[model samples]
Target: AQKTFKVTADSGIHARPATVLVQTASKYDADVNLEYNGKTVNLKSIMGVVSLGIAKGAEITISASGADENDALNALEETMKCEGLGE
Candidate 1:
């Protein structure tokens, strides 16, 4: 499964936010990836997320695959919305 979100945070996916995102993703047993600028990286890795250099207003595509892929994607989407990362 996959979903796209537009970052609305002024600071973008910086260290704290990235840590939150990675931590959230790590809770589920699924393979998650964040894609941007023609690059894709593991969503559970803080270093990978930081390496993307994602900034505000950037569009991100998240994909997950596993037994709980749908739940993982839904949880992430909720986190993005509730945490003000994206809409």
Candidate 2:
């Protein structure tokens, strides 16, 4: 499944939030990627996430497909919330 989430963290998509996002994405088996500003980045790579330079109001499109896609999506959703960037 796929979902697009808005950034609601006070600090925007800074390093700490990026770290948590990458770490959570790494836990899943699905091929997970985050799309922002017409760029697609692997959610498992911290560098990829950091390179995006996403900010507080940015929208990220998350896509995952595989046997564990649902789990991946759920984990990402929870991670976003933990980072205080959920709607």
| Per-candidate clash tally | 0, 0
Best of the candidates, lDDT: 1
lDDT of 1 by residue, 37-83 (tens): 78999999999999887889999999999989999999999989999
Q: Which stretches of candidate 2 lie over 4 Å from their true place?
A: none
State the displacement of the C-alpha of residue 25, model 2, in Å, after optimal TM-score superposition: 0.9
Q: Which residue pairs clash within candidate 2?
A: none
TM-score of each prediction? 0.97, 0.91
Best candidate according to TM-score: 1
1-87: candidate 2 lDDT, tens digit per residue: 899988887777767778888888888889999899899989888888888888878888999989899989998898888758754
